[PDB]
Amino acid sequence: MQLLSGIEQQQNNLLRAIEAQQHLLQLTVWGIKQLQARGGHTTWMEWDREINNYTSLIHSLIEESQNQQEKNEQELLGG
Amino acid sequence: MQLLSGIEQQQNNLLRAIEAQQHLLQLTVWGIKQLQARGGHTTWMEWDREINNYTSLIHSLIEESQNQQEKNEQELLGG
Amino acid sequence: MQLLSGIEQQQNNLLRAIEAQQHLLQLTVWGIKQLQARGGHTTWMEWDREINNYTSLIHSLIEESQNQQEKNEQELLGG
């Protein structure tokens, strides 16, 4: 159970990173639509905050995925 | 065969989502180049349609990846 | 060892593609911030070069991930 659990669990990390990256894509699509339609300083500050919130989350999911890769490989070698 | 098939098959779903997200990236890169070069209402309507077409596809691939994760985990537990 | 090695190794390819796509996201976020703040021809040429450098890398990682999927599936079938 132990090794296949680590493999399936890393597949969820990669999926979570894909989901988080997809939301970051919608934020970039939103920004392109605003500029094409053209001011709102308060709105663009919130946009910057959400870009950072999801950037920090993606890097956390990338780090967690890197940590699981090392554990899955450690388990494969000599197990 | 059954469990490793479900694992390999979910790796293809994640890859398909990465491929679909990559094409959505080129659409956002295209939009940034248009604004930097500056009108074309018909062209930006087609751009919005392709943003939605690939957004709907990515969510379909994310949902399919979530469905396979549950099936792979169900199979691991008690199998 | 052979099959699970190919599965774990493809998980690293997908993670490398996610990492490369994430850097391409920051380049698109950078471009949106420049236009919102508004000229710099030399800077936008370097931006285009880095968009292509990471686009070429992502497609290389997508191709490598597609090559590993076929090898993992070949190994599963009749092994």
Author numbering:
A (entry chain A), B (entry chain A), C (entry chain A): 542 to 579, 623 to 663
Give sentences from the paper:
Entry of human immunodeficiency virus type 1 (HIV-1) into target cells involves fusion of viral and cellular membranes, a process mediated by the viral surface protein Env (gp160). In the Golgi apparatus, each protomer is cleaved into two subunits that remain noncovalently associated: an N-terminal surface protein (denoted SU or gp120) and a C-terminal transmembrane protein (denoted TM or gp41). Ultimately, the extended state collapses into its most stable form, a trimer-of-hairpins (TOH), in which the C-HR regions pack in an antiparallel manner into hydrophobic grooves on the outside of the N-HR coiled coil. The thermostable core of the gp41 TOH consists of the three-stranded N-HR coiled coil surrounded by three helical C-HR segments.
To determine if asymmetry in TOH structure is a definitive feature of HIV-1 resistance to C37, we also crystallized an N40/C37 construct containing the V549E substitution. Residue 549 (in an e-position of the N-HR hydrophobic heptad repeat) extends directly into the N-HR/C-HR interface where it fills a small hydrophobic pocket bounded by side chains of Asn656, Glu657 and Leu660 and the backbone of the C-HR helix. The six-helix bundle containing the V594E mutation crystallized in a rhombohedral space group (R3) with a defined three-fold crystallographic symmetry down the axis of the N40 coiled coil. The V549E substitution did not disrupt the continuity of the N40 coiled coil nor C37 docking on its surface. Overall, the mutant structure closely resembled the wild type six-helix bundle (RMSD = 0.94 Å). Hence, asymmetry is not a general feature of escape from C37-like fusion inhibitors, but rather a special property of the Q552R substitution.
